[PDB]
Amino acid sequence: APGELTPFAAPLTVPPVLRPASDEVTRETEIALRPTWVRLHPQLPPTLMWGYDGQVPGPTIEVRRGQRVRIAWTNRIPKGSEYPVTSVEVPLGPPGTPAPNTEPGRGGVEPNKDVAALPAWSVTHLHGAQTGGGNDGWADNAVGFGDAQLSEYPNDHQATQWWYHDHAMNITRWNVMAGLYGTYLVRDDEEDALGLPSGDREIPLLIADRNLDTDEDGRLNGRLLHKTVIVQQSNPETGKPVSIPFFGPYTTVNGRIWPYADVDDGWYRLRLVNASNARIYNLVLIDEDDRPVPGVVHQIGSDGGLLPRPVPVDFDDTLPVLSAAPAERFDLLVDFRALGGRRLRLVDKGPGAPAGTPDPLGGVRYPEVMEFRVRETCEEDSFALPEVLSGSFRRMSHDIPHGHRLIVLTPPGTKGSGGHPEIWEMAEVEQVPAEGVIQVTGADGRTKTYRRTARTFNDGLGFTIGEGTHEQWTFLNLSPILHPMHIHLADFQVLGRDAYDASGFDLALGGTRTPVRLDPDTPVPLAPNELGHKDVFQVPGPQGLRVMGKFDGAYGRFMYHCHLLEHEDMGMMRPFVVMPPEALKFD
Amino acid sequence: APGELTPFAAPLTVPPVLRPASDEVTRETEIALRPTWVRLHPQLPPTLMWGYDGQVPGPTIEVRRGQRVRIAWTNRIPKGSEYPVTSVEVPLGPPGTPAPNTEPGRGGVEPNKDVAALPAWSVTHLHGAQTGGGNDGWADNAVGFGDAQLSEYPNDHQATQWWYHDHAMNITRWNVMAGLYGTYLVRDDEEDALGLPSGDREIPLLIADRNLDTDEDGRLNGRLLHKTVIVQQSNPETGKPVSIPFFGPYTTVNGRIWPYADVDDGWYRLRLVNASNARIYNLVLIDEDDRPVPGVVHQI
Ligand SMILES: [Cu+2]
Numbered sequence A: 001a002p003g004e005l006t007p008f009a010a011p012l013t014v015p016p017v018l019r020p021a022s023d024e025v026t027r028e029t030e031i032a033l034r035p036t037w038v039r040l041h042p043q044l045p046p047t048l049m050w051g052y053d054g055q056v057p058g059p060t061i062e063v064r065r066g067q068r069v070r071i072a073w074t075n076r077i078p079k080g081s082e083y084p085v086t087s088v089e090v091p092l093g094p095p096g097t098p099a100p101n102t103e104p105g106r107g108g109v110e111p112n113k114d115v116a117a118l119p120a121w122s123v124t125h126l127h128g129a130q131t132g133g134g135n136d137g138w139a140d141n142a143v144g145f146g147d148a149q150l151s152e153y154p155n156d157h158q159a160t161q162w163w164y165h166d167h168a169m170n171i172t173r174w175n176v177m178a179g180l181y182g183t184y185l186v187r188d189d190e191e192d193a194l195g196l197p198s199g200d201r202e203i204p205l206l207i208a209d210r211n212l213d214t215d216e217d218g219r220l221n222g223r224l225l226h227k228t229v230i231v232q233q234s235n236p237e238t239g240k241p242v243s244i245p246f247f248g249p250y251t252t253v254n255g256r257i258w259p260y261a262d263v264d265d266g267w268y269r270l271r272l273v274n275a276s277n278a279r280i281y282n283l284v285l286i287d288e289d290d291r292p293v294p295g296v297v298h299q300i301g302s303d304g305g306l307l308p309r310p311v312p313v314d315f316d317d318t319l320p321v322l323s324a325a326p327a328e329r330f331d332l333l334v335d336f337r338a339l340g341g342r343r344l345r346l347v348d349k350g351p352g353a354p355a356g357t358p359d360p361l362g363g364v365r366y367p368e369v370m371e372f373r374v375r376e377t378c379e380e381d382s383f384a385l386p387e388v389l390s391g392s393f394r395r396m397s398h399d400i401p402h403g404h405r406l407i408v409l410t411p412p413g414t415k416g417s418g419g420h421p422e423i424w425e426m427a428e429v430e431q432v433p434a435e436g437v438i439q440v441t442g443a444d445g446r447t448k449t450y451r452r453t454a455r456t457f458n459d460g461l462g463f464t465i466g467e468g469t470h471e472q473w474t475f476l477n478l479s480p481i482l483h484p485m486h487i488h489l490a491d492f493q494v495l496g497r498d499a500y501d502a503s504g505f506d507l508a509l510g511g512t513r514t515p516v517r518l519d520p521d522t523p524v525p526l527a528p529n530e531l532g533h534k535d536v537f538q539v540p541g542p543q544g545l546r547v548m549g550k551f552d553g554a555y556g557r558f559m560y561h562c563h564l565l566e567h568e569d570m571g572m573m574r575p576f577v578v579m580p581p582e583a584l585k586f587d
Numbered sequence B: 001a002p003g004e005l006t007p008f009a010a011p012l013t014v015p016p017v018l019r020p021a022s023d024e025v026t027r028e029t030e031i032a033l034r035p036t037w038v039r040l041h042p043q044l045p046p047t048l049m050w051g052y053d054g055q056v057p058g059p060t061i062e063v064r065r066g067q068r069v070r071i072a073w074t075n076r077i078p079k080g081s082e083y084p085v086t087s088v089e090v091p092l093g094p095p096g097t098p099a100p101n102t103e104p105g106r107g108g109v110e111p112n113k114d115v116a117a118l119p120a121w122s123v124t125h126l127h128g129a130q131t132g133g134g135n136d137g138w139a140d141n142a143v144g145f146g147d148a149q150l151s152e153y154p155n156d157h158q159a160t161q162w163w164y165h166d167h168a169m170n171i172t173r174w175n176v177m178a179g180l181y182g183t184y185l186v187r188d189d190e191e192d193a194l195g196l197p198s199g200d201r202e203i204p205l206l207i208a209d210r211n212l213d214t215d216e217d218g219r220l221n222g223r224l225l226h227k228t229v230i231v232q233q234s235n236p237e238t239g240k241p242v243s244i245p246f247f248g249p250y251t252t253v254n255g256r257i258w259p260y261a262d263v264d265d266g267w268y269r270l271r272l273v274n275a276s277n278a279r280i281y282n283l284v285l286i287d288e289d290d291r292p293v294p295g296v297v298h299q300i
């Protein structure tokens, strides 16, 4: 239409590669945060962003397992710099019409001045890294211009895809959107012996949705626009309006809106991460006629490394979409051998229309993510994918002695919560229907009682954990909304999912009237791609999720939280501490 | 058949060549034992092994008769390392059917926990070598992580093929299987004067049979499996069961199951050693119709 960007007008780029490992461990690699001008699209003007080394995404850091590395994340954004991200909250639109976050522009609403007034204040978190809390990017310890955050990463972890981004307390949703994100690949001998496509044929893909502001006649102007929609104008408990997380109509891949990539008719490896604030990409690979393309994509790794077996992603009805929530990583082989001279598209699928078809109304006005243009060669790729991938993979057993956490996730309108969803840490009991008490009727048909002991980031510490121990964490989502939960430090495995009836939960009370009931005639199968190592799993509701993990290889104070950046900036986050068992004896 | 490897799917490799002779005899060549992942077959995942210089087979050492050589066989396998070889003993199975050592997997049986607890404890024996007992790899004198066994080999012996391998007291059967073997060639003027095929045309072949573990659905998982068969469950004299030696279904040549080798229509020299625990290979050269080929092989 008039005023729309043409998809696939510009080629894909990849961030420059950084290899920081050296003989001299005391010689840090400075990674300087600097303002930079970014061409999102040939049809836009340049866009002001903040980049690690002036690049968006940041450089792709590459290391080998065991190579000890030191990085100085160094704020070089001058005092007085314009804040790259304009922020607005806008009214709801007419019902049954596309929400305003399906559109650019502010619709008359004034940029929020308090965001405009943000100085550069940043802390970098290497998401997925096994490293002590002093290295982790703790949210309060963001630094201003001239100052550094120093991180050691021992990198004593199997080959995987990590990624790094701003984590500044309360403002992570803006800082990350400004451009502070990048990926970080660890290599090892096990991965090497797989003989995976590499060099030219290994492509990091950092995808993120954006919105843009518009000029006064409605022309897009390239300015980053964090636009949310108000679902409650005035919250009964507080003064304040209440808004949903960020979703935008434009999809960026490696810092470009809707790029194309020229590839050969061979095997390729994609290191995919969703770096979006909140959007879940339900990805489908489709051909010129919008037909999903089976038998071509294979998932081979996940957050924490190689899967035990490759998972076919055939966009059939065993896995119709590859669902990628914020912060999740997918190690994908795609096999273009039979596809020379073809053009294929990765698209976000809307719930209300086929893959490839706009569904503005399902939150996907523009399906396009990126295009592959496959050149016919006369070459023969004999790459072999084995049926078992990793010989190192050992399945997590519930038989290993472990401790237990229950984390309840609550509906937004819950009592005492100011209209926001929350993390509630729960402790079991051994004054029935009361505030902060939740009963649960388990599978075995019996009922336990739990009390709420923390509801927000700054409540007193709940989880203190001996280094080297295993713990099973249950996330019990009592709401209809999906929270991609993330735990710093550790690798976990998914043990089980169960559906619940949660209509026993009284929002106005903030407790159960009648118990939350496991619902055993709704099986929730595990996704076929979540049986490896994960550190950020999706938790729909009403449901419960069982993960297990070894808290291993480092110490300190760490975070777990929701990875919708808006919910994270609004209290949906908790600390935990990992100490030597021997220091645990002193409390 | 479903779940079977395709023979001849990957090319033969040869260990890298090592040439330790030097003008300063007091400068040892360090040969460090390390964990390594090796791809036995394209249809398998990578396999955990222990290798001399991270190589399985270890490097082909080459020396001339009279070149005095000192080697520090140096344990660099980190403490806490997973032991690479899984050990089980399984019951007989029905008479007139293939023995269980004919099949991959453990069947029901538990990995032996004592073998799984082994730390890396190795001593290296140069099999063939004429050198004093101090150098020969006495079996009790295995070394743990961070230490070395030092060996002088005067190499005063006519040209031949020797081979080297772990010789650790009581655990040799697992250590060698873990990957600790390689070959060692001595050259001299007499063999040189025969002008034998050399370079590209001399190929060491270290053959060894192996067994592998399976997952629950019975897929091969690349994990080294030392699986022996119980022939007497309770020996009258001792508490304990008695099992036969190791035999396994897969043949590796230079660390690859059933490789192929591209050669020219010319004379080749093969330096063949059987590094198996126990299997005696009864070797036949056959053609595409399975006919044995006469007039082609000569042992020298
Ligand atoms: Cu993290």
Ligand SMILES: [Cu+2]
Binding pocket: A398, A402, A404, A472
């Ligand atoms: Cu449990």
Ligand SMILES: [Cu+2]
Binding pocket: A421, A482, A483, A484, A562, A563, A564, A567, A568, A572
């Ligand atoms: Cu959330």
Ligand SMILES: [Cu+2]
Binding pocket: B125, B126, B127, B128
């Ligand atoms: Cu001997």
